[PDB]
């Protein structure tokens, strides 16, 4: 039961590349439910890909690294 629980707890705790994948499949379900075009849907997918790739630049990522170290990074 401990082995099954550890395997299930590392599969349930997914990575960010599948949180982005199911963030961007119901988005495709919306863009194909309401029949969007072929240019602005590229803008939507490009914007969510760009904000996912730029999500690893936050100051809140290092909101506990002390001052005069965050100041050196800045």
């Amino acid at each position: 039961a401990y082995l099954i629980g550890n395997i299930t707890a590392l599969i349930v705790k997914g990575s960010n590349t599948e949180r982005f994948r199911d963030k961007m499949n119901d988005l495709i379900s919306f863009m194909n439910r309401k029949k969007l075009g072929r240019d602005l849907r590229s803008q939507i997918t490009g914007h969510v890909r760009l904000q996912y790739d730029s999500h690893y630049t936050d100051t809140v990522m290092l909101q506990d690294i002390p001052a005069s170290i965050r100041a050196k990074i800045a």
Partner: protein
């Protein structure tokens, strides 16, 4: 794609030339590529294609284990 049962019956019927039939299990690339062209298909949930991939790994590891279990009796 070499004929490994004409080579077997030509080379004095040696047992260790019939172990080269197991090279033909590299043709499961075409099935694992099918489950990679299906995981990026947004019509089916990716956590369901992972379950179908595990259920195609569960069987064919009981087919191969049945064949090896009979071979170890022969």
């Amino acid at each position: 794609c070499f004929p490994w049962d004409l080579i077997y019956k030509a080379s004095g019927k040696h047992e260790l030339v019939r172990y080269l039939l197991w090279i033909r299990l590299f043709r499961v690339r075409k099935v694992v590529e099918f489950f990679q062209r299906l995981e990026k298909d947004t019509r089916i949930n990716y956590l369901f294609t992972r379950i179908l991939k595990l259920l195609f790994v569960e069987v064919y590891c009981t087919h191969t284990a049945a064949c090896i279990f009979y071979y170890l009796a022969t």
